Amino acid sequence: HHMSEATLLSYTKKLLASPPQLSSTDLHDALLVILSLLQKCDTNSDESLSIYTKVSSFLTALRVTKLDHKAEYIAEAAKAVLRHSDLVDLPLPVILDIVGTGGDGQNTFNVSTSAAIVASGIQGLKICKHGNKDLIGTLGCDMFKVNSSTVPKLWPDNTFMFLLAPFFHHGMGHVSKIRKFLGIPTVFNVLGPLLHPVSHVNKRILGVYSKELAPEYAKAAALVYPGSETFIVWGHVGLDEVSPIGKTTVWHIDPKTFQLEPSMFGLEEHELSKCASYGPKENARILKEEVLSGKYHLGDNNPIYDYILMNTAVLYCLSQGHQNWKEGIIKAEESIHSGNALRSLEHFIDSVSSL
Amino acid sequence: HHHMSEATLLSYTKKLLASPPQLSSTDLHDALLVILSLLQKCDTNSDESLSIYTKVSSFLTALRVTKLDHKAEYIAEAAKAVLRHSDLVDLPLVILDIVGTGGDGQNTFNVSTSAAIVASGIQGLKICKHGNDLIGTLGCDMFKVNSSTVPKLWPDNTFMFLLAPFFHHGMGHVSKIRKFLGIPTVFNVLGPLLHPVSHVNKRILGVYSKELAPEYAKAAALVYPGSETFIVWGHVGLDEVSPIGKTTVWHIDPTLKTFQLEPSMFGLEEHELSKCASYGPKENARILKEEVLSGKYHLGDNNPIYDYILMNTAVLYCLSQGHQNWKEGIIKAEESIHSGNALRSLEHFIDSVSSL
């Protein structure tokens, strides 16, 4: 009776008011109504047409009003999505995540999964990387088997863990279809990085697609992840990563702004075209056979190798609480050429296989 | 990709999300043409239909939030696009219309149809009222009245009623999505600008809000060029000339002008809107035919609804003759009812429709 079209509509009407009368907690409650209604839309009935119309109306109004670009709304939106998530409970040390929002309209290499693996081979670092859809999937490893119930069994012995977002965030599965149909960006576009199922992570790199969004996204990350020291990163070319060409702005949350350039890591610049994504199987083959194998070195100017080294250098400096980027390079180089990075990944894959 | 595609619609929605918005009045026109093609060619229960309903919902919601749809040039272009799916009437070649936008939250008597019928009894006046039932309950199938039959009824009838659904097939297509949205959109204010007969040269257009009236005055001049028009707003919150308190009129007089009306100027007491309520289409029609039009009430009985009809007729008549002698309008509205002319003019229209 309460989780209805009529309730959703009363929220939509608050958004159309001048000025708007929708609080951040109102947004939280609205999204629970929406996720409730979208489970009911199993066929293309007229009921489904009505619900899809009302849901599209709500999210569209939220976007025009720009309240979804606001710290407290992003936080509340994330909170509501996570109510339909499998979360990991661990018994209560530097544990890091690296992920971006996407939505930069770019097709760059999976540098976050690769740098997470390289960072995980540096003594003292533990990496639990949470990402959307596959790369590790294609390396002989059924990511289906990594869920709420199995993450705790794997936690103790693994320097590196990978968590595939869709096996945790069922809520995101319900809005999947209306998001594709909408074509426009909505609050769901920036939630990915704030849906980490394991609360033990106390440091992260979160890429956003836009400079405009970064300051409020910084404040949302501090609301969703109160303990964590966080780098928010935007590549000036329009990139939710530390960019292999031109500059990257960093918003530093330390419970602050600076700039990164490849020259600061003793690296050449590489255009996005040189750092392209080939899809998860080819990306996996490149990472396994070109990078973790020790084929390339610092000084070879191999773009995707350079790109991984740089994002690992940043994970390292964040973990140690300094800005010695060339020390980070050295430590990333060591993690590759010692075989430590490849061992860390192989341990994780054996862990998952024998579950 | 074809121009009449989800991809084209999506591109227009994105212009509304921009800071500031980059959707022009002509873009809204194109956008509406795209919406009407998509909904026209909707495959029932298809994934397409769900996606089309999602994109259309998104556009119309985006548009209402920007408030762009309450601007003269946007309102006019939106009316223009809707009319490309309308059956317009072709007439060989003073004709008036009276209608309001609706959305004032009031449920008073159908003064629009009543005053249009009383006006049609006045020698020298022809009334072609366009509206979105009351006349359907008096024994006449309004579905018989369309673009191909209006011409047959045009020459022998002082009064005509046009039910909008039998003309605007474009409005028909957005009908279901308007109910699903449950919020006001551009479509909530276009009805009065969709008159299918170009021969109408004068009209009273009611609007629900003081804020909308100045932009709606401009929109009406773009949609009906060279039409003497009264935009009217009753201060109580009414898309008619109010039976209580003051009504503001914006005068589109092809020759900016505004003036205030109140009942005292007609020789009439005020009446609360509770004293002037709708009893639904059946009883409204019986009140109109058997009491009002049969001459059971006179000027000076202070019958609220009878007074309500006289006043709106007085305005129609003063508009028609190019003066503001309102009491003269009341004398003429009175002569129309008590002569049996108003009732004859209606009864003629009913019988015309019957023999189609």
Ligand SMILES: Nc1cc(F)ccc1C(=O)O
């Ligand atoms: N579609 C998703 C599903 C998840 F589980 C997590 C993130 C997304 C996303 O849209 O980024």
